[model samples]
Target: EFNILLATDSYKVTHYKQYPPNTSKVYSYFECREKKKYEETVFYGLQYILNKYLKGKVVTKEKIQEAKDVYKEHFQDDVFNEKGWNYILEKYDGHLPIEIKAVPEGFVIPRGNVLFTVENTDPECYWLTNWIETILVQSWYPITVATNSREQKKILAKYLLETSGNLDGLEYKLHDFGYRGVSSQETAGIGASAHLVNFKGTDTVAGLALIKKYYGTKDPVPGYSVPAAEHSTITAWGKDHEKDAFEHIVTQFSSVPVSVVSDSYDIYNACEKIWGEDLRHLIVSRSTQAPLIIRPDSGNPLDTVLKVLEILGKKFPVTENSKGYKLLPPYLRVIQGDGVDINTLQEIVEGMKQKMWSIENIAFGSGGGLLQKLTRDLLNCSFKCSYVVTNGLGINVFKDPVADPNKRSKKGRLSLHRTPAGNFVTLEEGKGDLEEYGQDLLHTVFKNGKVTKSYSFDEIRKNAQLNIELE
Candidate 1:
């Protein structure tokens, strides 16, 4: 049998030479107090997996090599800290058993979500753990948001489909102009991941990597200007007003399928008056598909959508054939941009339904409220490293939590039980939690600094989708 000791795929390296992307603060944990770069850092900031791995036996000598390989891959061994690994081996003689239980990575966890816990047969050593709170919370936020949004979006899709004859076209309404609506750079990507989970396609060009990161490289996002995913195959356009909107449509390539936002002026009138025959004809003549308005920004979205669709409906050529099929060959989409959240979008959708407007014909482009705005609330989702120790009274006494619930954490290690129905439900924390049920979540992801969990990008995408779906 081939032996493999699994470790984290993404290593957290805090050295000057190995800074992570989008990082803000830098800590000198191993500081020797001599103010020297060569000095040792006081705290071993290896966090969860490092703490989990250290309490176990080193059955395979290659596991020692695993630490060295992770060190080499992250930074120079001298600067990067491998002291924790060394200390564990020296103290335990490479032989110990510690079990882990964790919620699978993409599970939808709440504030009180006890995601993982670690424990050992020998109780005293449990107290040795500390310092894992900040990173764990940081890593899970994006995953949680993505998971929640996907669930909400799925609810919306199910709602429309049930009401509207099982229509997928209205799913595009939820999409609107998503690329520009997300709060910021990375947030958009996270939102895009969630959107895809609900069958809503996005125009968020920048969010490509996030979906690719979780899902894989196989199925590329398909909403570019030219409608191709892998590359920049199309052009994007936007402006504050309608004059700029007109200039927007004309300034770009004549028929290249340029998208122009018309929220600034009387957007309702702009679509009714300005975009009437000229813009639609201009787009069709150019051999291009729908030149979406990106988001015809409006305050009262339901009213605005009703008016715009009404006006557009008057001019749109609707022909009823002898076979009773209706043909309306017009490429028009109202991708709403400003002030739209999942909640607001749903309201707008419900409003459109109330007015009997073809709300499914519209698109939504959510930005700040859906993405960057979430960070404004100071959501410090963190995990703390505290041991569950038994006192002399033989009672399990946990550490005094920093604060009630929010700052407090589920103590120890954890794993997941992936269900047979293509989804996952988080089990309680502890290695023994899922073991008894014969269910396991952790697999050999990597070994000896080499890639072992080698599922192709497509498998990853389906798995990513399923990972969220199952949750």
Candidate 2:
């Protein structure tokens, strides 16, 4: 099933939402939990749904009747509102009469900050698509992945500065290995594309396809992968012919960078004998622009990577950076591809720093930990109604349950803008037009039925890295 279609779960709640009187101009919004849990979420993936699923569709009488029939057949009676469904069936057309606007995808919005706002655009179309709030709210994976990826970059950037005095190969520092490990092809595409906002290396080819399709990026995509050997390829050589595997990797990809997972049979032997001693001459003589990235797939991350580095250092040429950190020669490096999450990746870097090893000596590949291990609650993502107009009057509506003060929501129409002080602030857009705040960050992304804003993958990267300081 297409994710854009599968995104909405509460269509049953739609008609019920329309039943409320003068629900005209319902302005609702989404925000993540406060900053203590995370720096913030990187907004993404909305344009996909708006453009791919909702644009220029013929909303048919047959389809509305089909939706109503399905709801009646599958759901509890209390949850299905026939009056609301009938109202839409009588008044509606094919497309939604709503305006959705947000900070451009890839903007690093702070925690509890309004990333975007949705409202009924047509003054007469007050009852439009109210049940869609759940689908819109639940769409948090891309933002979560992007924020997590950016945080990982911050950690790597810090260590790169401390150890190497500069970030030379930072683009290839974190590679995405999550495609095969996530829930679906769509998950892989979305999550890997999210990671690409910060880094360039990736094995998820589908991510590049997403960049092309959704972000309007084409050839020379934002992410790339190198020829690599996995466990199956190495193990198929048998323990006895392991040396052949190493020999074959160099001979096959001698002109380009190739990663060989050395942990198939005693990673220590693979490093000390096969990679370090047996293939050392071939690796050194290649003179390819890309280095041979040795991958260690199993073992304690900090220890395995450090031990491999220590062993390789004994046989390979080495140098020292300006910071007095040990740097591997240009011909070879290590990519700890397994057991790498945000915390473990940092630990590896920190351990390497203790050994005075340049962070540039190794890169990382994160799989399930990067994409499959997150949830909406991790970022405290929530969507709520901030304002609604009843009849001709403006009402600043908010939810403040006594049990949880943290659940308090914003009130009235919201306008998010960067303040003169460089901080983002939200202003109440009540009945009368309030003066526009500094450079209104929220613009008309989608108005009525048209997508007004589009961003390329490169533009998204520029926006994501905007003013971000790692030190």
Candidate 3:
């Protein structure tokens, strides 16, 4: 089921015969195009792809036969490259003869710069380079998610500095509630791990497994979650027993932070009467290190969050940060999880700031908006052929579409270089060897079906850390 030959688009199967007759090498590069939602991108997740699908003895006789059978039926024609597959199997011992150079994972690169390059290492396996484009292009998923997650961290840091004058626990601010909201388990793992690149709080168990298996993290669990109640867990206790459900969660998980979905029946009643009036002492008397978090799952995120904070403020002890904004007691806080995206999150934080509340008063949880509500266009990700060698002659190849100038691709062998002033620039058309361009930032990550470079989860997190300062 995991055959590499069957992993690409059907049309890609016919591409080998379409290239120029003597095409011996096809060079392609992947980049996030310019002028999109975000000006920069977080390059990541290629290591996972390399380790999982592209590494070591990927082609075999049985697998090739299976692919041939499937493709014959898929196209109703004999378009599958049997000769190419056999060449890889017999000559390279089932290993793909391709080299991939990429910028280190977790590097924050400006849009339009080359993130990675792919080329056939063997002259006979030229078609193998772009045949895997369908899988390699999937880096967009993690890249988009990481960019969005990192951008959110920047915004959150700005607000945290403005309101609380402290950026403590910023890593735990945005919890990942995206496991169940994404399309598949793989999507959940990939998208959630991308979120983990910026934040540490998560409920996605699959993300931890993915980080351990692919990224080789020494930390067994890269992401964490607190005991949190879902709608069904609370509603199953019956509406009249809502307070009982809240009390049970607090008592059951007394040693750790617990999040309860307070809006199961009435958000106001649950916050004001049940939690504020009835269970106030029990919640406050518990270990302050293990705070009871109230979750508002429905209604206008901004208004509802502000309102819930106000009610919790009147009930619980309202302290003040150094910036003079109101803060909930360490034992009490709120988490807004419903209807949250980047735009709504900014608005919610802004509302809290306007209301003279500390940004640290509440954490956030994002589901669909975090993992499902994105697209490749979010970063304008594209992989295109730029250079090729045909009949022993190196040729610069590119597309200059007259219709859409934005679709124009870069030409020739490309290199990403860092300027002396500490900015990145892509030197196109064979300028990498020139002294003025400096050393190419792109390094060989994968070559000849082996991982040439690898990074740990902590290393990647450090690479992506934001330098936010407190006033």
Candidate 4:
């Protein structure tokens, strides 16, 4: 199952014979066809994919045999590309002879632009390029997650600037609570790391491991999480001892910031009596600068958060920032982990703003909304062959389906470029290299089964930083 040869669409096994006779080369590009909710995408995860699955000698006789057997049984025919696999093993000693060029992994580029291009470096390996598309297309996962996170960051930043008059602690505003909400461990890792490109708060340990293993060797830890309590721990106290449970959590994690789920019994009572009245002194007198974050995991998110804030505001001293928005005392804040998504988040922020509450008074934790509640069509991500060389002649290829003009693919070779006005444009049909087209953003990231360019996690974060001016 781990065989690279079998890591493709089963019908692709017969693609070698489908190509035109004397086909020598094939070129394809990956792109988002149109801007959906967000105008741009944060290109990411291709580097991780390259480092983990495509680097070094990736083909072997044993793997080939496994794929062959599997495909023979799957298709009920001997349509496996045995000749192509043997040719790769013999010619390049099992290292793929293809090159992948892409925008820097953390680039923030507009939609309808080529993010990456793939082509066979050797004529004999033309089939290898598209064969790997199955795995490469998986890049959509991290890209979509990163885009969602970045868009959320934009929303938070806008509100933060308007309410708090600055972007302080913006990186910690949205925490990754998606570790268990994803389809698999690898999805958690990839989606969490993508979220890290915009924020520093996460509960996904796998994301840290992935960044360390694939992003950079010397890159500083890319994420952080405070000690937090879940519903089970809070409810395990059996309601009667809920105050003791809250007290235990605060006392244990006193030196550091800790989060406790306060919605197990009655959210309003937990905030009003337990945290706001009985344990107010312990929380306010915490030894560390980190605040005790109260999490309400149930009820209408906007109404529940505002109600908790109202209770906490009554118990604790509330101050005003320069913008005149109400700021919860430094030692207290609320985090809404339930019912958080881009839309609900905006509604909550708008409600807070209307109530004269500062954006810094709360943080958000998202699970399915962060990772699992997305699709490849979120940005219309696609990979299609655009150009090919056959019998010593180069040809441009494209598909303009009569049913949908949006499905029309770009023609010929494509290159991404930036304009003098700080906008991006895609130059198609071999026009990207012209001096008038501006600087090419696409660079070779992989070639001949070796990673040509590697980017540090910090570099990626820097590249992906919010550059657009907000209204």
Candidate 5:
């Protein structure tokens, strides 16, 4: 009954990849062969022990003819007889093409968003997508990572800017710690891009899709021409090295923000001699923008930043840039990097509310506590089958029964839209009434199964600048 010619036995496909060697580099995953000569028997299936159902493993080229036996292209039998794009062509009596629906990368999305929707070209060839599990979730994982980071950034952004003077202040340059925490560097990059849409400044350098997806063109970190470290000084207090380190810290980092480790030798000594007079002159001489920052690495960070400012005000020249400036001092900043947590930050900000700690003088490079401490427990994840077809139209809907709000699986496909306020919302199922279902999602980012996007780490970095709220 099926009249599907499938004119060609093989259809060219393409997918982008991030090899483990380095995610900054990408490759295209496409299988190409002359369809006329590409007999089903010549195609290998089932790659791994787990994918034996899919004919998981296959090794073709062999030196000895004897070794070519195991390399046999398998499933030429009944199992595959009714599978793949070819099988779809046979059953549907219509053209065969893959239909996919995914959230745009870097689009600030919500929990209930329809992250992905996939269907086959041939109606009867429905079996094709079910077996392509490996490919489907490739993009889904990024959705999870991005959404996760987007949510977590509230605390990070809050702490970073709250400690500073204003919420609108730049609190970017967030190191992508999740890169190390992910199952693979590649996935982490995907998550980084997704999260950047919401959080903005990030450290992960995944590649083009991310850069372009988040930043319009990936030329520069949007707010800035470069993606460099924000000034954060932590001059550890010491005598010779620490003192000299603090004194020269201003000159060392040049115009970039400087974080001196005040505890390198002696906090008090460096605060008086180094931060007060020595660094002040250097910062003033900078040709371009320069930030003079200081941090107390040894003592309690809250008290250290405060006491240092008090002492500096008493001992040094109060210029426009210094704390004692005739106007609010613009020169010195108090960036902290020690063990900073939500509770600690909250307590400090409240304590300094009535005091004169110069909230704007503070920034944070906190690790281990905020970013790293965010574990899977704090993040809940569930991927329920949202749509399934029985006869022709999408019938079976909502995999898990509705238990509660977060627990229920969204029924049917989802679409994303942004509000004028810049927040995002998810439109589900027929609600979107998409005129072009698949086009809005994943498009031809690749060609002939080849990546169409440029690949470079710096390029990706620039993309972050464009998107992130980096000051």
Candidate 6:
């Protein structure tokens, strides 16, 4: 849809090549130096570009010039140089000479480790390094988002382990409510899929499309959402007739797992008087086939949810699980969608455990914090040249900015080796290979603008399970 507008960067990126002649290769690595804000970055979004953008298009002189004209038109000058344009037009084929190797899509890597590498395979296509980086570097979103999501999983796992003594039904605990919270459709699609690596619930329907498109899975996708009410439907019934609004939900969606926004006006009264006193019978009748999810949206999240859960526990009976945790009966549950970040969620779950309430009684919905609120610095993600080739010799390349010691980059051709001790180490090329350590975790996922290795959604999801063992 945006072939022209998106071409802006791909065109301008080629004009700024200030490298030496016979600059045969530019070997770069994507790294996260410190986990200042997040624990681990779950690898994602690289395959989307590989499948959709990189392998599909053929480069033509006219296409190059068209991008050039658009670039020049915007700058109002001849800043769009013709040499780089002609170099790509004459020698460069449609496919890039880029070879990308990385850890699997959902593999978790700690800070200061390499996530992926981009290198010029054919000596003739050296300029495409920065070209690919201009497009590929935007993957900071998926990495950051995936990291945030994995952290949420860990948070949920901690409470689930404490209350239930195991990580049962952990995938359904944190649902993606961030579709509307994101900036664009693409962000929604990619961000939702990131969440799916850790969980199985999502209101963002676009995530399913991404799973089908990028992952190319033939079976069912992981993320799922159910029939749920919003504020408009409940409030439209007016304040005096709140019972009728909730009644419509039970009668309409009684046979399925549906959610209703209960805090339209007097949430406590609706829970205590309407749901607690009146609708208890219908909920009980529908308990076997379908369960109703009461969503508390306003006020203090922990206090509101605790009070509502208390009201529901009094009206209905509680069942003691084998672990002795008090679980609400099967008919109804609560989802605290408001103020549900990692810390707030921990507080609420801790409250439930203190009251002997089962962790299964409530779920969480995260919006901006899950999808749009993070930046590249959250994981300190950066792409830098570690090695390059001028004539025939491979020269070690690095950057040690005097302004900040932390901004230093690695030198020499690099290989990532996972020690038998299960820790990752960046081995410089001069220091030999992975013979001493275990093996290289980075595998070739793309080569010469084609996807060489592929992973399914199930495979990625299962791979992400290895991440829960972290501190």
Using TM-score, give the best candidate's number: 3
Where does candidate 3 have its weakest 10-residue lDDT segment?
462-471
lDDT of each: 0.43, 0.78, 0.90, 0.90, 0.41, 0.78
lDDT of 4 by residue, 1-471 (tens): 357887888888999989998999999999988832788999999999898889888889898888889888999999888888898898888988989999998899888999999999889888988999999999999999999999999999999999988888899999999999999998999999999999999998899999998886354788999999998888888879999999998888888888999888899999999888888889889753778999999989999989888888898988888899999888888899998999999999999999999999999999999989999999998999999999899899999889788899999988888787878999889987576877788899999889999999888888899953332
Ranking by TM-score: 3, 4, 6, 2, 1, 5
How would you encode candidate 2's per-residue C-alpha lDDT over 323-432 as one tens digit per residue?
A: 99998888898999899999999899999999999998889999898889988888888887877777877788888889887888888877777777787777765522
lDDT by residue for model 3 (1-471), tens: 599999998899999989999988999999998851588889999999999999999999999999999989989999899999999999999988999999999899999999999999999998988998999999999999999999899889999889977788888888888888899999999998999999999998888888988886666688888888999999898978998888888899998988899998799998999999999887888677899999998999999999999889898888887898998988888899898889998999999999999988888999899999999888889999999998889999998889788889999999999988999999989988776977999999999999999989888887787767312
Q: Is candidate 1 or candidate 5 better by lDDT?
A: 1
Clashes of each: 31, 1, 0, 0, 41, 1
Quote the RMSD, in angstroms, for model 3. Answer: 1.4
Model 6 per-residue lDDT tens digits across residues 1-471? 323223436444543557777788888888877632565668887888778777634466667667667767776766665565465446656566679988888777777878888887877767666666766777888878777888878878887887777786788889889988899998899899888877888999999999997786556766778899999998899888789989988899878988899888888888888988887777777754478889999998888888888888888888888788988888788898987877788888888888888888889998886888888887787888888888888899888879788988888766677776877677775453636766677899888757999888877776777444543
- Note the residue pairs that clash in candidate 3: none
Provide the TM-score for each candidate, comma-separated: 0.58, 0.92, 0.98, 0.97, 0.55, 0.93
Query: Model 2, residue 293: displacement in angstroms?
Result: 1.1
Candidate 3 ranges beyond 4 A from true positions: 469-471
Q: What does the lDDT read for residue 220 in candidate 3?
A: 63
For every candidate in turn, the CA RMSD to the true structure comes to 12.3, 2.7, 1.4, 1.7, 13.4, 2.5
Off by over 4 Å in 1: 1-130, 169-204, 210-215, 220-258, 277-294, 318-329, 375-436, 442-471
Question: For candidate 5, what is the TM-score?
Answer: 0.55
Clash count for candidate 3 is: 0
TM-score of 4: 0.97
